[PDB]
Design a protein around this nucleic acid. Structure first.
Length: 366
RNA sequence: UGUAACUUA
């Protein structure tokens, strides 16, 4: 427009950056190789004291993002030096979060990375603010970006926030928080996973039937480098309430996941002889529990799924040393008992499926 | 017969 007639050194780069027309003008000027280095250097010096302002700006953030693909190391470094103590405010912000992710995505070196982490430390960001960011609509996308871009050696402030008091509940039982927590465990180190796994088990009753928390428990059941400890821990914490948990909407999926995990281990043998022997002892104990409460499980709206999972011969066909003996005496007993209970559930819409699972047991037995 | 969660002209 009338702007594109003035020399670049006479542009008020602040007023343009906060203006839609002006911001688009500067971006497409950075994309002009003749002007690129010059506008950048002319832009950088004038907007330098307004970095935080531009970052949180509806139009300014678009310039900052674009500017990240052109800055030098020293330039981007000095940018981060100016704004690192304000990362919480930035991450919370609708526009700031888009800027910080792009900054994190275009880091040049550890000096820049450590400055960002330094801002997330307790010196500038309290634990309750980190917890906030994890559960925040916008901030959680910054925590994720850290989780995917930076190395786990930098995850300190995140780990510290989760293991603090009962924050594991606040996070796991939250829509945004449960996601980030699963994103973390996917790249975390084993010792960091343990540190979190302790807090989860400690607050297990508050997570296992939670609408989101149950997904955290199930995610832990996929981490193979946990079976040596997690199988005994859970079952010892849930055995007495195993029937109750099987009849709940959310925790029943965990039970099914648990049972399936027990099968895939003992079937793989035919992990570790400590894990396996424990898996066998739990499974046998589980079948004992399901026989005692068979009357209730077969009729419950959620219990029946766990019962079917346990009765599905598709999961334990190779089980047909001495363990396999008293297994069949228990799982076989449970089959013939379920067979007697069939006409007492004819009013239910799932009697057909259960009757078929005792039919599949005969096809494999005889 | 039964659950997800993961964002600006």
């Amino acid at each position: 427009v009338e702007i594109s007639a003035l020399p670049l050194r006479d542009l008020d780069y602040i007023k343009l950056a906060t203006d839609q027309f002006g911001c688009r003008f500067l971006q497409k000027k950075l994309e002009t190789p003749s002007e690129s280095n010059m506008v950048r250097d002319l832009m950088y010096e004038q907007i330098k004291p307004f970095f935080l302002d531009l970052i949180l700006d509806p139009f300014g953030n678009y310039l900052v993002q674009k500017l990240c693909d052109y800055l030098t190391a020293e330039q981007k470094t000095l940018l981060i030096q100016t704004i690192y103590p304000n990362v919480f405010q930035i991450s919370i912000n609708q526009y700031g979060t888009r800027s910080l992710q792009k900054i994190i995505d275009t880091v040049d070196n550890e000096v820049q990375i450590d400055l960002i982490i330094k801002g997330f430390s307790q010196e500038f960001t309290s634990i309750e603010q980190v917890v906030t960011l994890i559960n925040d609509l916008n901030g959680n996308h910054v925590i994720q970006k850290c989780i995917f871009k930076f190395s786990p050696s930098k995850f300190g402030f995140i780990i510290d926030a989760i293991v603090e008091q009962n924050n594991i509940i606040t996070i796991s039982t939250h829509k945004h928080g449960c996601c980030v927590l699963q994103k973390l465990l996917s790249v975390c180190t084993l010792q960091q996973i343990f540190k979190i796994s302790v807090k989860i088990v400690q607050f297990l009753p508050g997570l296992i039937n939670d609408q989101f928390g149950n997904y955290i428990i199930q995610f832990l059941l996929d981490i193979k480098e946990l079976d040596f400890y997690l199988l005994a821990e859970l079952f010892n914490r849930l055995s007495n309430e195993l029937c109750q948990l099987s009849c709940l909407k959310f925790s029943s999926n965990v039970v099914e996941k648990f049972i399936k995990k027990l099968f895939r281990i003992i079937t793989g043998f035919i992990a570790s002889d400590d894990v396996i022997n424990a898996s066998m002892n739990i499974l046998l104990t589980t079948i004992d529990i399901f026989t005692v409460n068979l009357n209730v499980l077969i009729r419950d709206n959620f219990g029946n799924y766990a019962l079917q999972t346990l009765l599905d011969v598709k999961n334990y066909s190779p089980l047909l040393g001495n363990f396999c003996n008293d297994f069949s005496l228990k799982i076989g007993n449970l089959i013939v008992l379920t067979k007697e209970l069939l006409p007492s559930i004819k009013t239910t819409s799932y009697a057909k499926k259960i009757k078929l699972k005792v039919k599949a047991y005969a096809e494999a037995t005889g």
